[PDB]
Amino acid sequence: MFQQLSARLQEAIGRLRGRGRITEEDLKATLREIRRALMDADVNLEVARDFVERVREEALGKQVLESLTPAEVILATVYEALKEALGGEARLPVLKDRNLWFLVGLQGSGKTTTAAKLALYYKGKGRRPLLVAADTQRPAAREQLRLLGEKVGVPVLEVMDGESPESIRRRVEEKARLEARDLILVDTAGRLQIDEPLMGELARLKEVLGPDEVLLVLDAMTGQEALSVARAFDEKVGVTGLVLTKLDGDARGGAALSARHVTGKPIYFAGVSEKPEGLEPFYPERLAGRILGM
Fold this sequence. Notes:
Blueprint: H1 3-14, H2 24-40, H3 45-60, H4 70-86, E1 99-104, H5 111-123, E2 129-133, H6 139-152, E3 156-158, H7 165-179, E4 183-187, H8 196-209, E5 213-219, H9 228-236, E6 241-245, H10 254-263, E7 267-271, E8 279-281, H11 284-291
Parallel strand pairs: 1-4, 1-5, 2-3, 2-4, 5-6, 6-7
Antiparallel strand pairs: 7-8
Helix pairs in contact: 1-2, 2-3, 3-4, 4-11, 5-6, 7-8
EC number: 3.6.5.4
Keywords: Cytoplasm, GTP-binding, Hydrolase, Nucleotide-binding, Ribonucleoprotein, RNA-binding, Signal recognition particle
Organism: Thermus aquaticus
C-alpha cells in the first residue's frame, strides 16, 4: 500500500545517501521532494506542513549537516513524522464482558462486509459474536449480511421492516443472552449520501442500544475526501474509532495519513485484502516502517 508514496519518500531520502556530508541545500532539495510526495498522495495540507517541518527541525537538531550518515538521520526523522500522522501508538477497543458496537458509514464504504470480517476476527480470538443487520427499510441490505454471516460462521439477527429500536434492543439482548454472545456487532443502515432522516433514527438507535463503540467504516481508496463524512456521523451520532477499507488498493495514502488530523478519531482496524481475513488491527509504527521500506 502507498507504493507511489513509499517509492518517492525513499528516493528523496536516498539522495542524501552515500555521498559524504550533505549541505543545507542538499537537505532542502530532499525536503521539497518529500513535500511534493505528500502533496501527490492527497495528504492533508496542515499534516503535510507539520510533517516536513519536524523532519527538518528534528534532523537539524540531530546535527544532520555534520553527520556522515545523513540519509540515515533523515530516515529516522521521516519515520517519526509518519508515525505521528498515523496515530503514534496502536489501539483497539477495550473489550468487556458484554460489548455492543455500531458499524456506521456510507453504503459501499465496505461497512457491511467489515462487520462480518470483524465478527470473524474476534471469533478467532475467543469471542462469541452476533451480527445484527439493523437496516429496517432495505431487506436487500439485511440479506447481504445474512449471507456474510454463514460465510464466516457467525449468527445474524435481522431486524424486521420498520422495527422500532426498542423492539430491536429486546430481540437482540434476548438472543445474546440465551445464546451467550459477548460481542454484538450492529451493521447500521447506509446510503450513498448522508441523509438527515436516517441519521436521526441512527442517533435514536444509539440512544436505545447504548453502543460501547461506534466504528465509522471508510473507503481509503476515496482518498482525503473519504474523511468528509466523518464529522457528520460524529456530530449526530458519536464516533469512537475508524476502519479504513481497501488499503491494499490505495497507492496514495492520503486518508490514512490525514485521518488523525481531520477526524481526530483513532484507526482501529484496516482492510488489507478482499479475503475474509483481510481485516487486521491498524499498526502505525509497523506501517510507518513499511512505507520507509524498513
